[PDB]
Design an enzyme around this catalytic site. Sequence first.
Site, short mmCIF file in Angstrom:
data_model
loop_
_atom_site.label_atom_id
_atom_site.label_comp_id
_atom_site.label_asym_id
_atom_site.label_seq_id
_atom_site.Cartn_x
_atom_site.Cartn_y
_atom_site.Cartn_z
CG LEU A 1 2.23 -22.53 30.90
CD1 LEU A 1 1.46 -21.47 30.13
CD2 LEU A 1 1.30 -23.65 31.34
N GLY A 2 6.09 -23.94 29.03
CA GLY A 2 6.92 -24.44 27.95
C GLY A 2 8.14 -23.56 27.75
N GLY B 1 8.88 -22.07 24.73
CA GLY B 1 8.56 -20.99 23.81
C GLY B 1 9.56 -20.77 22.69
CB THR B 2 9.52 -18.53 19.74
OG1 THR B 2 8.40 -19.24 19.19
CG2 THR B 2 10.48 -18.16 18.61
CG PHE B 3 11.87 -14.72 20.85
CD1 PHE B 3 12.99 -14.41 20.09
CD2 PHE B 3 10.62 -14.58 20.28
CE1 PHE B 3 12.85 -13.98 18.78
CE2 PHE B 3 10.48 -14.14 18.98
CZ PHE B 3 11.59 -13.84 18.22
N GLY B 4 11.71 -16.90 24.75
CA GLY B 4 11.89 -17.26 26.14
C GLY B 4 10.71 -18.10 26.62
CE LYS C 1 6.36 -14.87 23.16
NZ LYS C 1 5.90 -14.54 21.78
CG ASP D 1 5.27 -22.66 13.32
OD1 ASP D 1 4.71 -23.58 12.69
OD2 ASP D 1 6.10 -22.87 14.23
#
Lengths: 300, 407, 367, 87
Positions: free
Chosen positions: B12-13, B15-18, B35, B129
């Site tokens: 998908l993307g 992400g912030t961390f992983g 996630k 955020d």
Amino acid sequence: NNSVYTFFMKSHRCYDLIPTSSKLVVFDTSLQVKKAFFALVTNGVRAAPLWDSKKQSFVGMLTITDFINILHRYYKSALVQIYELEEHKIETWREVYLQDSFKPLVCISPNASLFDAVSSLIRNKIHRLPVIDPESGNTLYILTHKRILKFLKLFITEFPKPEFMSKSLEELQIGTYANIAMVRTTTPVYVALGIFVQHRVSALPVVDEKGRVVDIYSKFDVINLAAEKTYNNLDVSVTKALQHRSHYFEGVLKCYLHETLETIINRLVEAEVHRLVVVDENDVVKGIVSLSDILQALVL
Amino acid sequence: VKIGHYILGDTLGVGTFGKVKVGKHELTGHKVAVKILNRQKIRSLDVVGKIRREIQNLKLFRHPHIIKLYQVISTPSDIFMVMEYVSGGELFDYICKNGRLDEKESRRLFQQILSGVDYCHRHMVVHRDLKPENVLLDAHMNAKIADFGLSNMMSDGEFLRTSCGSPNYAAPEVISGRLYAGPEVDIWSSGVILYALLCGTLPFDDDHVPTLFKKICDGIFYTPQYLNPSVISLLKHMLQVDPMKRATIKDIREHEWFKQDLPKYLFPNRRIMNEAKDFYSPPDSFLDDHHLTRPHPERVPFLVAEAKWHLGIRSQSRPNDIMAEVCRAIKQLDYEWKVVNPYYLRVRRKNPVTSTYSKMSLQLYQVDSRTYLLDFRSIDDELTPRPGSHTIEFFEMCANLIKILAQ
Amino acid sequence: GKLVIWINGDKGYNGLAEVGKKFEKDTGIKVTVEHPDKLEEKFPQVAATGDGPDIIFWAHDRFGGYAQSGLLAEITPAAAFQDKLYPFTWDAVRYNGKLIAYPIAVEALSLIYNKDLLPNPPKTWEEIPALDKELKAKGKSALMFNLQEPYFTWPLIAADGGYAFKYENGKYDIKDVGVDNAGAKAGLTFLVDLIKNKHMNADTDYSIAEAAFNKGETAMTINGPWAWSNIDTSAVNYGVTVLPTFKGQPSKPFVGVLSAGINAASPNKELAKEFLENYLLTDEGLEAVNKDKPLGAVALKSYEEELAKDPRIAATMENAQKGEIMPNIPQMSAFWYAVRTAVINAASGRQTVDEALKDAQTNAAEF
Amino acid sequence: PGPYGQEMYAFRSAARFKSPPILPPHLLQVILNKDTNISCDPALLPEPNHVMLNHLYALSIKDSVMVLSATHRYKKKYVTTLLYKPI
Ligand SMILES: Nc1ncnc2c1ncn2[C@@H]1O[C@H](COP(=O)(O)OP(=O)(O)OP(=O)(O)O)[C@@H](O)[C@H]1O
Ligand SMILES: Nc1ncnc2c1ncn2[C@@H]1O[C@H](COP(=O)(O)OP(=O)(O)O)[C@@H](O)[C@H]1O
Ligand SMILES: Nc1ncnc2c1ncn2[C@@H]1O[C@H](COP(=O)(O)O)[C@@H](O)[C@H]1O
Ligand SMILES: OC[C@H]1O[C@H](O[C@H]2[C@H](O)[C@@H](O)[C@@H](O)O[C@@H]2CO)[C@H](O)[C@@H](O)[C@@H]1O
């Protein structure tokens, strides 16, 4: 009778009784009296739990009855004697006041039931019952008769309303009907204060020459002396002291013996007063009812 | 990866961390969003508690417009969080794809969102955020709030020092390194999202980064003829640079535009107290046409016969000087302290009558270039039922301090 | 100014210190030695950033995933040094045509059996539950090894015809998943029939088996060259013999190599990595084997002629001939964690044998 | 996780030139100076904010006595405790 009220007061605790956000004060024993008294009008509260710094406990309560007691007990003349009681202390009046009897401070946990609260109220004849949590030790609120009766009447609904509504006030014989303490509208405050301290009365409805109640003199009204700095002169009558709100009050709140107890308690929670003076077509005062009597009837 | 029954699909993307992927059930074909927090990459940083305060929180949360954490499974390779997966994708791709939206849609969505962020605020969490790229849409095109990596836990009487998030959507106060409460920065990011949901364009946009902060700190913004003045009002009062004049969830609830076309399944002994006990906000219209009021009997001599509460102790002097004076007087009082920050103390005394102990915290502030403020904060006791008054012991410690500090 | 060397807990710090004393005297710098628990996870935390320690001692295989990341250092072989020192070990440390590790010791697993009790050691896996059936009348047990690490448990699973990976040639199919086959089904089913029939305790970890073996409470465990230093403190007279076969087919123990990998530092010389280390390998490696522990399998023929006199070394040899060298690819790392999770899920009752094998295949495909 | 050099004596000043924290405007909003409704109750107060609770709101000392107050939380109930304590 006791099938629904006693159950309703045993199943619900004192915690729910407390309002959401409130303002409460406490006093130190080393504080002087007149300071705290002048403060009680500016803060808008009439009662405070006394905290002694040394003993690390709540030694007692400070209400307007204490104010009345110290004012009557120490009063010689109206302009040149007032020195002595200005410099008086709270713990000094505490020490001299318990020469006659030793009445400690009573408190109830807010997790306990409402029944135990109104049991402490009647059994100690105290209007002001603090709630102190056992864990935190903090004094949340000061329970009153008026709150509990407003919460009883407003909560009740027609389907759980009892069959006791039908009986009238007269026939049920609730209140003090024998010895009605009264004062005249030309009598000074001092005698009313005498009557307060000597008896167990909470207010006096003043009468005219005929005996028709035109106004009332409450134990709460006396703080306006300490508010307008007119506590110096006690020679003036109760009409001079109540003259301040003569443009403001609507009228005398009163009921009859032939009305139903429903309408009486509804006009009592709607006027938010301590009593309804029962009169007749003449307006002669037969008997006086009280909030405490109504609570005593409700519990049993 | 597979733990129980899921074979991962397309990434998908980042992400912030992983990164995050899509599971697929091996027998029924259910689509979850997984996630992946890489173990190595989070153990490198010190963020190992910051994830914990997410994992604690998301175990409890259940809301139809919030993305629900199902379970967190930990294994030495990496950490896995399983959540519901929605087909519609992120909001910014619908903003992009559809351009500017009408009132019915933007309204409906904003209601769903605001209801989410209320539900979060009430349970004492604030996710810093807020942006369309962090919020998703389902097959029914509702509002789903996905990314909770940048969240935090709300503590009692505790402000926030950490300021992060998008540069456009960061609050005016947090960009200058100021302490702040959680609700108003969320409300302000809500209001800029709501702006984006109407005009299509960002309210505070610029390439040069210092100019962008100046444009945020200034209250002016574009006001088209595209929409009715009620929303213009609501935004001006919602996007106020002053946090004292910034609206709250209540202030938005009773607004005219907001009420219109609102299904009531968003906002839910408590209700008994709400109705009858409370009767026992001042209305502007009623005051103008009514000259008669019924005063409470306890107050009736006060408005016939008719006090400024300071924050705390203020002494204008050097910071190190005053803090040294305080550390000298608290030692003269024979009590004991620890310091975390040079301007922060955690101090405690022992009861003289009992064996118990009471605590409190000191944090020095600045009201302005000429004057400082010294704040006094109380604490909680976790376990034992103590036969003494926390509040009074606190007040007496503060008194015994302030007496030596004044005289 | 200080060289921190993290070492595993089974290793002895004193032996490493004795080898390091000679280098230490010339250099004049002293080396601290610690043993942090779970050194598998402690190195790639600081290796990705370059923090903390300088030298890491660990098996070669989990470096082939460290190298694929790009964290590890690079060395270049020398024509006059590579040929003289070692005939073939270079093959094992040659990643992408470039050497990445220094081959120290050819190691293999072996059977450590009691001599006074159970005088004859078994040679097949098919008579071990019958030897436990015979020994549960006297109060003893045949085999009690660590069931938590798959390094010990694999050669029983893969012996019935279950293979994760084929290396006949370079070509292989990533799409094909092969651990749910018949052999691995019969080997996991036979280890669940060994646990269910109350022959083996399913709660013994490395610590329990290490305390039961250092005290002499278990007659057999497959540990390696470490625990012999603790058998010398024990009364038990012991031997070292070939791992047991299975249906004629011998067991295939994996061949670890203890390696020393430089951790990242802000200054790093290129010559020091190869030229300086090669001189160190000749002295640091030869002395360590001679002083404390006979590894027995070295690539220098001079000190091999002396070590090939021990029949325990020829037992390690006759194990390691019948086995299979481990591929150096990084995905074997992602294989290791698969197999451990096969052996703790079937043993705890969370998953069945078929489910565990299907889960392992899915982990190979989906990670 | 912050190191601190010396405790018994002050060795040196902080390396940073300026480290004052600026007061947020949420503690300047006092609830006692808010004028409540005439009709409801002098005892009650409007609902305060969760942040400003534990902090101490001291009234200015006027006549040789201290006057301090704090808002303490409970499960679903807030209370404001005022204490007047002589020196
Ligand atoms: N029967 C009555 N007729 C006329 N006025 C009344 C009557 N009862 C009370 N009042 C007025 O109402 C005011 C408040 O009376 P009340 O004693 O109920 O108040 P309070 O003492 O503050 O309440 P609480 O008893 O809960 O402390 C008094 O000033 C009094 O003048
Ligand atoms: N909780 C209490 N415990 C003991 N004595 C009390 C308590 N509350 C009040 N008193 C005493 O009883 C007297 C009357 O108090 P109370 O009836 O509660 O107030 P009021 O007379 O104003 O209704 C006061 O003089 C006070 O000293
Ligand atoms: N003004 C009064 N005259 C006669 N009796 C009273 C009067 N006020 C109160 N009482 C009595 O005192 C009791 C409790 O008083 P109180 O709690 O102050 O309401 C009641 O049972 C009443 O009968
Ligand atoms: O069990 C998994 C583990 O097996 C091997 O680890 C060995 C290691 O080689 C020895 O030096 C010693 O530490 O015993 C270990 C087993 O407990 C593999 O080398 C390793 O990659 C794998 O994780």
